[PDB]
Amino acid sequence: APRDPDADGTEPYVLKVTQAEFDKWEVVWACCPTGVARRIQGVPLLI
Amino acid sequence: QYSIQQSLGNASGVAVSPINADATLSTGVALNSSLWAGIGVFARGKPFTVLAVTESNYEDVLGEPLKPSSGSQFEPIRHVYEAIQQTSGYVVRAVPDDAKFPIIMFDESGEPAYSALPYGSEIELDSGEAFAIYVDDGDPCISPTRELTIETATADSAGNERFLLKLTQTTSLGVVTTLETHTVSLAEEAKDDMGRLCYLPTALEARSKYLRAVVNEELISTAKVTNKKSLAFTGGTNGDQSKISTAAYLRAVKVLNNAPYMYTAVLGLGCYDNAAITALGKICADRLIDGFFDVKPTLTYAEALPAVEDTGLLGTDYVSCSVYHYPFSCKDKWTQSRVVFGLSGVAYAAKARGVKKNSDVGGWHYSPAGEERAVIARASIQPLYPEDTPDEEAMVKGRLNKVSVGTSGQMIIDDALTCCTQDNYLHFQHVPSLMNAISRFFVQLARQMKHSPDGITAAGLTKGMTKLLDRFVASGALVAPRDPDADGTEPYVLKVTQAEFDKWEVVWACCPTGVARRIQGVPLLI
Amino acid sequence: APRDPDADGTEPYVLKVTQAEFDKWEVVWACCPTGVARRIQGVPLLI
Amino acid sequence: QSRVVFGLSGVAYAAKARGVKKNSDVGGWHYSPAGEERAVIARASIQPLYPEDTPDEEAMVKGRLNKVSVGTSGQMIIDDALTCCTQDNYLHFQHV
C-alpha cells in the first residue's frame, strides 16, 4: 500500500487505458514497490 | 563478540542509541537530618578549625571538661554536652594569643632540642637542625604528658634506612599507655611492608592525628637518627581563656562560615559578644538556617529587655533567629557545685525532638516549646531573684521567650518567638522553618535542571514541586485557607511563568497550620 | 510556538516560495527556536 | 605523572557530541554545550593557580566569555555557553 494514504489510494496498483489517437493507443500503470530493510535503529526508553 | 555502534551512518550496519531516561530523575535530600554548629573555648582541640563531634568521641576531641572555678570557661563545654544528646555537631575552638605549642628539633648528629612557639606563627629551621616535630592537636603536655621514643629498623631492598616513632601518654600517677606507632624513613623514595610511602612529613600528614614534621631541605641527604628513649615535650602553656578579644571571635566565625559540611542549626555556645552574635545571625540569614541565641543570664528581669535591643538582631532582616533568657541556677553533674547556665541547646533539643516525630517529610511543624518537647531536666533549681515577677506583655513586645513551672513541677518553655519586629506571622518560629526547608529543596532540585530545553524542564519542575507539596500536605504542614470565599480550597497554589527568554519564574503559595498558644472558654446556661 | 500568539500564528514555522524573476527563485522560512533555561528565580508567598 | 596546564578545547566538542548523540535521525542539535551531564571535565586532580581571587561574572558576560564552576558532586563544570557576538539579538547563544 502507498506510503501516503491521504494523497494516494489504498490500491497498490492503478491502471488506465487511453485510446487517444485513432490508431495509436496508450496504457499507463502505477505500482508501489516494497521496502528493503537496510538500516535498523532501536532506542531504549525507561518508564 | 563485537562492538555495538551508536548513531549509525548512511548504510549497512545497525546501531543502538544510548539509554535515554528522563522521567525517572529525582533528587535525594534527607530533609530530616538536623545538625548544629557553634564556636567556643575548649581545653583541647585544633584552633580555628571545624571539628566534628558525635555522641561517643566528643569528650576525646574537646578534652576534659573545664573546672567551674575558672570564670566563663565551663559554659561552652556544658552547652555542647546538653546539645549533643540528640545529634552530632560541629565546633570551632577559639584560643587566646598567649597559648603556644611545643616543638622538638633534631640535629644532624641526633641531639634533640626543645622550644615552644605560638599557634599562628610558622616554624623556622636554622642551620644544623635536620628537622622538627610539633603537635598538631594543640593539647598542652601538662597533666597527662606526651612522650616520643625512637627505635631503629631494617632496610628494604634499596637500603633506605627507616625507624620507628612511638608516641605514648603518661598520667600523673604513672600509668603509661601506647598511643601511636609509625615507621618513617628520611629517604624521599621509601616503601612500607604493605607498600605505603614512607616519608616523615607525608606519612604524618596521611595517617597521624597528633604529630606533624618539617624537614629542612639542606640536610635531607646527610641525616642520621640514633636510639633515644622517652623524649618529653617541653612546657607548653595555655593563656588566660577568660578574656577573649572580639577579633578572635570574628575570625572563628569567618572560619565557620566557609565549611564544606552541612549543618541545620546554629547555636550560641555561651558567647555574649554582640559582634559575634550579629555575625552568627548574618550567617543564619544567608544560609537560611535556623539560629538560637541566649542573653547573658547574669542580668536581672528588668535589664533583660535592653540587652535584646543591644544585640543587632531586633529587625526584619533576621527572621529565623530566636533568643532566650534563663536567670536560674543548677548543679553541675561532673562537679557538685552551684552553676549558672544559658538556655541554649535545650531549644535545639526540643527542635530535634519535634523533627524526629516524622521520618521522610521532616516534621518541622512543631514549635520548639511544648509540654513534652521541652522539659529542662536538671538536678535542682534555685531562683536567684525571689519575690520578683517579670512582665509578660513587655517580654512579648520585646520578643523574649520566658519560662514557667509545668504541671509535674518541671520548668518548661511556655512560648516560642523570633526576633521579628512586625506581627506579620513571622514572629512565630513554626513558619520560617517550613519556608526555609521548601526553599532549600527547591534550590537543590533546580540546580540539577540547569541548561535544559524548554518544555522538558517545565514538566520536571512542575512534577517535582507538586510531589513535594503533596508530601507536605499529607504530612499536615498546610491547612485549608481561613478565607474560603476569597481563596480556593487548595492548600497550595503553584504557577510557572516563562516570562524572559532565558529567565524563568516559579511562584508557590502555602497556608501554614495554626499554633494553639491561647485557649479561652466560657460557660453558658440553658 | 511563538511567544506572541496574537501577532504571530501558532505554526512554529512559516515557509513561502516566490518565483519573482523568470530564472531566479526565492524561498523564505521562519522558525521559532526553543528556550534555554539559564536563570531560574522563585519567590515564596503566604496565603 | 607531572603537573600540566591545559586549554579548554575539545571538552566543549565532547559536550556537543554528547548532545548530538541524544537523537538518531534528526541530529539532536538542541542542547547547548554546557550542561549538568553533558560537560563534566574529568581529570585526575585540579589545583587552582590563583587562590584568594574571584572573577567578575558581569564583565565576562559583557566580554562574551564562558566560565567554569564547581558542580554538586564536586566536579568542575561549564556553567554557560556563549558565542562571540557583540549584539544581544538572540545570536550570542550557541543553540540557535
Numbering used by the authors:
A (entry chain c), C (entry chain h): 482 to 528
B (entry chain b): 3 to 528
D (entry chain h): 338 to 433
Show the paper's wording.
The phage tail is a macromolecular machine responsible for specifically recognizing host bacteria, penetrating the cell membrane, and forming a channel for genome delivery. The conserved structural components include three main parts: a baseplate, a long inner tail tube, and a tail sheath that wraps around the tube. Phage P1, a temperate phage first discovered in 1951, transfers DNA into a wide range of gram-negative bacterial species by universal transduction and has been used to construct a fine structural genetic map of E. coli. During the tail-contraction, the tail sheath undergoes a massive conformational change and contracts to half and more of its original length, exposing the inner tail tube and providing the energy to drive the tail tube to eventually penetrate the target cell membrane.
Similarly, we resolved a partial contracted tail structure, including 15 sixfold sheath rings, at 3.9 Å, which also allowed us to build the atomic models for the tail sheath protein gp22. The tail terminator and tail tube structures did not resolve at high resolution, probably due to the different helical parameters between the sheath and the tail tube in the contracted tail, resulting in the problem of center-alignment. Tail-contraction causes the length of the tail sheath to decrease to 940 Å, and the width of the sheath to increase to 275 Å, and the pore diameter of each sheath ring to increase from 82 Å to 108 Å, resulting in the tail tube’s detachment from the sheath. Vertical compression of the sheath results in a smaller helical rise of 18 Å and a larger twist of 32°. The separation of the tail tube from the sheath provides the necessary conditions for the tail tube to penetrate the membrane. Structural comparison of the sheath protein gp22 in the extended and contracted states revealed that the dramatic conformational changes occur at the N-terminus and C-terminus. Specifically, the C-terminus of gp22 oscillates at a small angle, whereas the N-terminus oscillates upward by nearly 100°. Remarkably, the “handshake” and β-sheet augmentation mechanisms of the sheath–sheath interaction are still preserved in the contracted states. Our structures confirm that the N-terminus and C-terminus of the sheath act as a hinge, while the rest of the sheath acts as a rigid-body motion. The baseplate was not found in our contracted tail, suggesting that some degree of damage to the baseplate during sample preparation led to its detachment.
